[PDB]
User: Which sequence fits this backbone?
């Protein structure tokens, strides 16, 4: 059921996998846009 | 009778159980009180025997899980073929195998990792592979990327089929217990249907596809101009232009004129001088003869027509002259215990893998394999490791049988009882022989190191000093090298070039194989191998034989297969369980296999592999230093580890830097395991108490109470990280060395 | 009742209750114990009958183009062996009105309608007479046996009415004329592989001079 | 011609001998078990057969295939040892 | 051919053809260490002679002076030194184990159960006589082997 599939998608390993995948994607895209940074130059 | 009987709709397909972790266990289904629960959930997942005591349910679960494994394997093969078709230089490699390095993995350009796309040749940049897929694909007649795409798609469809079959044969139509216990019919089908027909179909493919394609390939024809595989089928003139025996069709097959087919059914032996591999016609005749052997074999057992040997009758008929029928009662044991079957099958498969590793280096079956040194080293080492692991698993599951299934009140066997009644004598004699071998093998190296350090080289054990020649091995070599002509008149050359008969095969200015000489160093290292193997046997056999009791713990079988100890009394009783014997055996297995692969690497680099000039002067990679330097420990330390580690430690800044990074990381993991191996859990629980106080101070103490790892889990984590670190260190060392210098 | 290769286990469930029952189960696939999926006597009988019914017109339609062309009633361009009509592209082709593949989708739509509509009656009989189907739903009801639907649509002329044993005799005739057609199809499939000539043409060679027999056609040319 | 050759007669002789051995109680069969190799027992085939001696259809094929195997072995051995022409 | 020892399975062994055949029992009963009715001195003398005779070869053929004109003397001296060490060890064991005046601890029953007089060897004085005999016989046996090998120079095989 929708209730049961929503319950199964909330278990700890599945949620960890999704969270870390999204975070890794964000970090990869940021490093593709502003590469080779050793400091904060904006201000 | 042998009939297909099932039950319809046994288990309802629902998502209710997915939302209840631990559903399979009556003690786990409650929910967690401590962190230990979580670990237990993963440790007891595939232990079906402990879930219930019903044999039929266990069999059904086993069947479905095996279908799942087949689905995963098919996914792996589909990925391999797709990556070969989409991201490789296989087509370019087809036109210059000796100068181009195979590659089928490429990386994306971020954070500077694109440096790993190395210059492998043929206008392509990527990571070099050592699995040997290119040689296998060339031997199959593959010349295009479209064919690889089609194979990958087919593998994806097969993976889907296997997964659906698992679902159907579990949740819809589950076979009954009588279906699984028809061992005669299963043996008949797997001997004849699976092996015999499989070999027949592959031999047919080799005769109708592989040979004509490889003829054009070796004739120097552009791959895009080679006729398509189906042209050789619907146009027999094209195939007859190479093998004239195709003009008469299959008439000689039925008229017993088989000598007409000698053009592509040979008994040559040796190697093809162009590719450096076995003749394809020999392989085809081999698969034909093997197919006949298995087809005949698969008619021995009786199913439904009153013809064929019954398995129980054979075992009960042999009996024994020692006042009893020894082999009576084994059929019942082997038809009611999954663990005993698993033990026997694991032992057989593990030994077979070691045989495969030994035979594939000395009789290289694929074209352009022998002169690809990295692939040869990789294949030998890989199959050695796999075989060792399977053999250890055999002992583990035999112990499980002894603890859980053995019962002399319902299923008696005389031979097992007789063995259990002289276990002291057996174990004591094995202990003594281990001590004798250890002394008279390792002490020789110690004596040589001492004599060399004291300036007395004339008192060493060496070819220039006190000699210990392996005369029996030399005699067997001489018999095998002169076999063509007297004892095997129908063969042209011997089975291998290593036997003798001075002759060398060179492909692209590189040595493929040649005779291998044996001396004092070979004698010493062979008796070292004997020592390590006998010790491993001592440990594992002690584990299996004393699983149920001993003079120290009379009632050990009541404590189970896997328990940490029985207390500090009686002097101390840590590690008396059978699981601990398996735990200890893994270390000695690692020792033995590591020495085997080091011996292989040094001997092959020193006496076989190398280059040859126009005049025929062979220069070896390490220049024949094995004979004089491998007879002391200082020689192994200086001339093997220190000398050959240079490639892996100088790899930074090139395409091989990943191997240096893995070298360091694997040393790290190996050293990390020692923390788990040397300590105990009481210290760690006491530390966790202090940390939990701090979390309680700030209202962040979890409801799932933290606990230290159990004693067994500590040992398991320790041995796992020790093995991973050591094996990965050696992996990086080998791959960097052989790729850079070979 | 001429029993043919009847075993002791097979005689229990084979008692002449179905048309064309002769008792030939040398493997036991029709045993009533342990049934599931597709192996089931009703499904096996339905499948045998249906494959035979298809094979009837399959064999009939694969011979008429050659013989009728030979007799001089079809243009020589159309009259060709069955395996040279486009179903096997490597063995000759013909240019039809649309395409070798567009015709496949056009055919598959119509055939899938009939097959998906027929499958429902097997599950719950009589369920196709309920919903509106352009007014033809009052006739697509069924009879009670999926194998023998009957009705005005499937029996416009009452050839199977006013008698009972005659219906059994007709079922027995159908079984025979359907079992013959499957073997005929198998034969005409193998003959084209081993000879490469039209099956009707192969008849005359053996009919006139019975010399070019199977032995002379064992070399397996192209 | 193939018919009448040395190879064409050996196979027929071996097959006929094996069939006669299997049917007339000179060898084990569906209705005749055996343990040591010389002890001819009496089993039940379990399948209906017209032949009143017990010979079954699955029992014809066993001796038929044994005859083929033995005859092929003998013919090829004779061809290799000399005593017959290599190609007939 | 395997039976319980003396018909008593519950003792910690079971008789085999190895441990119960009369051929082994005759040979083991004819050895000097099992002649319970013989003075310890002669029993020790035979043991010393045999072992000293056998110990000459290794030292004379494998030592650090084997390729010198005085290899035989070095081997004989090594055998004599080893015999001295073994005699010291025998005296130490005897002193540690047996006290003066204590009765013999040797078994007093046979296979059939018939009682027998205990062996004098397992005493403080019998062991001393055996040790002295072992030392004397060892020196004599080493000297005899040296005399036969490197004085008369008999024609052996690979001496
Ligand atoms: C489509 C094939 C087919 C099927 C499903 C059946 C099914 C049946 N037949 Mg029928 N038959 C079929 C073809 C044929 N039958 C016969 C001759 C008979 C007889 C004489 C009898 C039956 C009977 C039966 C019934 C019980 C036997 C049984 O175990 O059935 C379940 C068995 C199967 C599903 C086996 C299916 C095998 C499969 C089609 C082929 C397997 C591979 C082949 C060995 C090799 C094929 C190679 C290719 C190149 C052709 C059952 C309804 C008995 C009965 O009482 O009928 C009312 C009976 O007495 N059949 C012939 C003529 C030779 C056939 C020719 O095609
Ligand atoms: C000739 C018939 C035949 C064949 C080809 C096989 C083949 C196989 N059996 Mg065996 N099996 C047979 C008859 C046969 N069986 C019979 C009669 C019985 C009952 C006594 C069993 C009972 C049995 C059990 C209990 C198990 C097997 C398993 C296996 C697999 C072993 C692993 C392997 O080598 O995979 C090699 C892989 C391949 C060759 C690629 C897959 C190719 C396809 C899938 C082969 C399908 C074979 C099958 C007979 C098809 C039937 C179709 C039909 C029902 C519609 C393998 C796929 C084991 C397994 O893993 O099962 C899943 C297993 O646990 N079999
Ligand atoms: C380098 C490390 C090392 C060494 C030397 C040993 C040595 C030994 N182990 Mg151990 N072991 C080790 C690591 C090691 N182990 C580790 C890390 C583990 C944990 C996984 C184990 C687990 C383990 C198990 C589970 C078992 C052994 C066994 C053995 C014995 C094998 C029998 C043998 O060869 O006797 C011959 C002796 C030697 C080879 C030792 C070296 C002797 C030298 C070369 C000569 C000495 C000359 C002279 C006497 C010097 C005197 C000097 C004077 C001043 C005193 C032996 C005592 C097995 C056993 O007991 O078998 C009977 C056994 O069951 N080990
Ligand atoms: C290892 C391979 C394997 C084996 C040993 C079996 C064995 C079996 N299958 Mg299964 N099957 C397999 C693979 C296998 N299957 C695969 C790969 C598929 C494709 C999804 C199927 C699809 C399938 C169906 C659709 C049916 C069976 C059925 C059967 C049964 C009868 C087989 C027969 O008559 O011959 C038997 C228990 C039949 C059954 O359930 O009989 C009760 C049945 O109807 N099988
Ligand atoms: C949600 C959408 C949906 C889906 C996925 C289906 C699916 C299905 N319906 Mg259902 N249906 C739906 C909605 C849907 N229906 C609705 C809303 C109604 C209420 C009116 C119905 C009423 C209905 C009826 C009455 C029937 C179905 C049937 C079917 C089945 C047809 C199987 C087949 O082979 O078709 C084959 C068709 C195709 C694969 C698609 C081909 C499309 C072609 C290319 C269109 C060409 C048009 C052409 C240009 C027009 C001019 C041609 C001229 C020039 C010659 C299938 C299971 C039939 C069935 O089997 O019932 C048991 C059936 O009888 N449906
Ligand atoms: C039952 C229908 C049927 C009929 C009427 C025919 C008729 C004919 N076949 Mg065909 N045939 C059939 C079934 C049939 N066949 C079947 C079931 C097969 C096996 C799949 C074959 C395989 C076959 C081959 C390979 C050949 C013929 C040929 C012939 C012709 C010469 C006779 C001959 O040698 O047959 C041979 C028949 C057999 C060896 C087996 C027949 C078995 C049935 C049960 C009788 C003739 C026109 C020959 C031809 O074309 O000559 C020009 C030829 O080469 N047939
Ligand atoms: C390291 C091992 C070793 C070596 C190098 C020697 C060497 C020698 N032994 Mg000795 N021996 C050994 C071990 C060894 N022995 C052992 C273990 C035993 C007991 C089984 C004996 C029992 C023995 C006897 C009984 C005799 C020798 C004799 C000899 C000499 C002649 C051997 C011959 O001709 O053959 C030679 C100096 C012979 C000798 O010295 O004759 C004068 C002689 O009679 N040996
Ligand atoms: C390899 C051959 C090793 C020697 C087997 C010699 C042999 O066959 O011995 C005889 C016996 C087995 O042979 P039998 O003819 O007595 O057969 C008895 C049967 O009931 C079981 O084999 O073996 C033993 O008693 C122990 C064997 C293990 C090794 C003991 C040392
Ligand atoms: C028309 C046309 C047109 C165009 O131009 C072209 C085309 C398209 C090609 C065409 C078509 C065609 C078709 C449709 C066909 C079909 C067929 C079939 C269905 C067959 C079957 C077929 C079928 C078959 C053979 C079958 C067979 C079977 C068999 C043997 C069986 C046997 C058996 C039995 C009984 C039972 C037991 O227990 C076992 C055994 C002993 C095993
Ligand atoms: C009716 C009748 C009769 C007759 C009968 C007959 C005449 C029969 C026959 C039968 C027969 C005549 C049979 C046969 C069979 C055969 C078989 C069954 C075969 C098989 C084979 C095989 C299996 C082979 C194999 C192989 C191959 C393929 C290759 C390689 C080599 C070998 C050899 C391994 C009489 C008068 C008596 C009585 C009355 C009735
Ligand atoms: C180090 C050590 C420990 C302590 C080690 C422990 C408890 C392992 C801890 C594993 C992880 C880090 C626990 C936390 C897991 C959480 C799921 C992580 C959540 C946060 C992430 C998502 C980032 C033992 O308990 C022990 C027991 C017996 C012998 C030796 C030893 C031993 O050596
Ligand atoms: S130290 Fe650990 S393993 Fe040993 S007895 Fe104590 S609790 Fe058990």
Assistant:
């Amino acid at each position: 059921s929708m209730r049961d599939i929503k319950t199964y998608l909330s278990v700890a390993p599945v949620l960890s996998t999704l969270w870390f995948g999204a975070l890794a994607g964000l970090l990869i895209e940021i490093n593709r846009l502003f590469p080779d940074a050793l400091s904060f130059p904006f201000f | 009778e042998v009939k297909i009987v099932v039950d319809r709709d046994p288990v309802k397909t629902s998502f209710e159980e997915w939302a209840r972790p631990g559903h399979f266990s009556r003690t786990l289904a409650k929910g967690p009180d401590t962190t230990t629960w979580i670990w237990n959930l993963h440790a007891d997942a595939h232990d079906f025997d402990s879930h219930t005591g019903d044999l039929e349910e266990i069999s059904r679960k086993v069947f479905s899980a095996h279908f799942g494994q087949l689905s995963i394997i098919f996914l792996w093969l589909s990925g391999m073929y797709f990556h070969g078709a989409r991201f490789s230089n296989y087509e370019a490699w087809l036109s210059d195998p000796t100068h181009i390095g195979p590659s089928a993995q490429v990386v994306w350009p971020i954070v500077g990792q694109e440096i790993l796309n190395g210059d492998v040749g043929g206008g392509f940049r990527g990571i070099q592979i050592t699995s040997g897929f290119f040689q296998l694909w060339r031997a199959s007649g593959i010349t295009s990327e479209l064919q690889l795409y089609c194979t990958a798609i087919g593998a994806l469809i097969f993976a889907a089929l296997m997964l659906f079959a698992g679902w159907f044969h579990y949740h819809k139509a589950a076979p009954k217990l009588a279906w699984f216990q028809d061992v005669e019919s299963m043996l008949n089908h797997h001997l004849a249907g699976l092996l015999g027909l499989g070999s027949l179909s592959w031999a047919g493919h080799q005769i109708h596809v592989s040979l004509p394609i490889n003829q054009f390939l070796d004739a120097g024809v552009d791959p895009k101009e080679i006729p398509l595989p189906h042209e050789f089928i619907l146009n027999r003139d094209l195939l007859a232009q190479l093998y004239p025996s195709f003009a008469e069709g299959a008439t000689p097959f039925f008229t017993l004129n088989w000598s007409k087919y000698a053009e592509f059914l040979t008994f040559r032996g040796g190697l093809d001088p162009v590719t450096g591999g076995l003749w394809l016609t020999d392989i085809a005749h081999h698969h034909l003869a093997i197919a006949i052997l298995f087809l005949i074999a698969g008619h021995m057992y009786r199913t439904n027509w009153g013809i064929g040997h019954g398995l129980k009758d054979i075992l009960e008929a042999h009996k024994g002259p020692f006042t009893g029928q020894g082999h009576k009662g084994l059929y019942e044991i082997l038809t009611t215990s999954w663990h005993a079957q698993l033990s026997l099958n694991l032992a057989m498969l593990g030994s077979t893998t070691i045989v495969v590793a030994h035979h594939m280096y000395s009789m290289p079956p694929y074209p352009y394999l022998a002169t690809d040194y990295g692939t040869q080293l990789s294949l030998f080492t890989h199959h050695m490791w796999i075989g060792g692991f399977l053999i250890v698993g055999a002992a583990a599951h035999a112990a499980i049988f002894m603890v859980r299934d053995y019962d002399p009140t319902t299923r008696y066997n005389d031979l097992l009882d007789r063995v259990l009644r002289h276990r002291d004598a057996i174990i004591s004699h094995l202990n003594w022989v281990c001590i004798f071998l250890g002394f008279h093998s390792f002490g020789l190296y110690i004596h040589n190191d001492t004599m060399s350090a004291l300036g007395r080289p004339q008192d060493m054990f060496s070819d220039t000093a006190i000699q210990l020649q392996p005369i029996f091995a030399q005699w067997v070599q001489n018999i095998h090298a002169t076999a063509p002509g007297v004892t095997a008149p129908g063969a042209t050359t011997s089975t291998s070039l290593t036997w003798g008969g001075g002759e060398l095969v060179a492909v692209g200015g590189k040595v493929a194989l040649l005779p291998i000489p044996l001396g004092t160093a070979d004698f010493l290292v062979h008796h070292i191998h004997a020592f390590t193997i006998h010790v491993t046997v001592l440990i594992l056999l002690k584990g299996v034989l004393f699983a149920r009791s001993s003079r120290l713990i009379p009632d050990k079988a009541n404590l189970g297969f896997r328990f940490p100890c029985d207390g500090p009394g009686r002097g101390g009783t840590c590690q008396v369980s059978a699981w601990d014997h398996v735990f200890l055996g893994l270390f000695w297995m690692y020792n033995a296999i590591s020495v085997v692969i080091f011996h292989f690497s040094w001997k092959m680099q020193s006496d076989v592999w190398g280059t040859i000039s126009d005049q025929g002067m062979v220069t070896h990679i390490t220049g024949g230093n094995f004979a004089q330097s491998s007879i002391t420990i200082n020689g192994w330390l200086r001339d093997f580890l220190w000398a050959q580690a240079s490639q892996v430690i100088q790899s930074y800044g090139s395409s091989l830097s990943a191997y240096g990074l893995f070298f360091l990381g694997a040393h790290f993991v190996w050293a990390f395991s020692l923390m788990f191996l040397f300590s105990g859990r009481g210290y760690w629980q006491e530390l966790i108490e202090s940390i939990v106080w701090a979390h309680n101070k700030l209202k962040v103490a979890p409801a799932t109470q933290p606990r230290a790892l159990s004693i067994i889990q500590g040992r398991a984590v320790g041995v796992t990280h020790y093995l991973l670190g050591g094996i990965a260190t050696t992996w990086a060392f080998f791959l960097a060395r052989i790729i850079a210098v070979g | 009742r001429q029993l043919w290769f009847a075993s002791k286990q097979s005689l229990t469930y084979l008692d002449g209750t179905l048309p064309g029952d002769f008792g030939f189960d040398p493997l036991g696939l029709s045993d009533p114990e342990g049934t599931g999926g597709f192996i089931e006597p009703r499904w096996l009988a339905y499948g045998e009958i249906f494959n035979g019914r298809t094979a009837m017109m399959g064999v009939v339609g694969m011979i008429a183009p050659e013989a009728l062309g030979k007799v001089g009633l079809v243009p020589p361009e159309t009259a060709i062996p069955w395996f040279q009509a486009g179903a096997i592209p490597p063995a000759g082709t013909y240019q039809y009105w649309a395409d070798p593949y567009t015709l496949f989708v056009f055919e598959m739509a119509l055939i899938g309608f009939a097959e998906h509509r027929r499958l429902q009656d097997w599950y719950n009989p009589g369920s196709m007479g309920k919903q509106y189907f352009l007014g033809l739903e009052k006739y697509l009801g069924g009879s009670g046996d999926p194998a023998y639907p009957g009705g005005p649509i499937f029996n416009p002329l009452g050839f199977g009415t006013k008698s009972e044993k005659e219906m059994k005799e007709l079922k027995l005739k159908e079984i025979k004329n359907g079992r013959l057609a499957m073997l005929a199809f198998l034969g005409m499939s193998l003959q084209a592989i081993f000879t490469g000539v039209g099956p009707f043409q192969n008849l005359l060679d053996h009919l006139s001079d019975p010399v070019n027999n199977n032995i002379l056609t064992s070399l397996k040319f192209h | 011609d193939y018919i009448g050759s040395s190879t064409n007669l050996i196979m027929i002789t071996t097959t006929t001998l094996m069939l006669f051995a299997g049917r007339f109680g000179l060898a084990p069969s569906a209705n005749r078990k055996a343990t040591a190799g010389l002890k001819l027992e009496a089993r039940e085939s379990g399948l209906q057969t017209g032949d009143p001696a017990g010979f079954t259809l699955a029992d014809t094929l066993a001796c038929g295939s044994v005859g083929h195997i033995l005859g092929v072995g003998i013919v090829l051995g004779l061809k290799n040892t000399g005593v017959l022409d290599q190609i007939i | 051919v395997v039976q319980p020892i003396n018909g008593d399975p519950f003792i910690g062994s079971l008789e085999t053809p190895v441990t119960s055949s009369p051929l082994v029992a005759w040979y083991l009963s004819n050895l000097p260490a099992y002649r319970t009715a013989v003075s310890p001195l002669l029993r020790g003398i035979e043991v010393g002679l045999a072992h000293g005779y056998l110990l000459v070869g290794p030292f004379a053929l494998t030592g650090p002076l084997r390729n010198t004109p005085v290899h035989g003397q070095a081997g004989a001296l090594g055998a004599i030194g080893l015999v001295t060490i073994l005699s010291v060890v025998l005296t130490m064991y005897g002193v540690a184990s047996f006290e003066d005046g204590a009765p013999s601890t040797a078994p007093s029953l046979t296979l059939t159960g018939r009682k027998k007089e205990a062996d004098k060897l397992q005493t403080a004085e019998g062991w001393a006589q055996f040790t002295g005999g072992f030392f004397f016989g060892g020196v004599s046996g080493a000297i005899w082997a040296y005399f036969l090998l490197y004085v008369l120079d008999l024609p052996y095989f690979f001496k």
Q: What stands out?
A: Residues B 4, 6, 161, 164-165, 169, 173, 175; C 36-39 surround chlorophyll A (ligand 4) (CB under 6 Å). The beta strands of chain E are 3-4, 14-15. Helices of chain E lie at 17-20, 22-29, 40-54, 56-62, 71-97, 124-150.
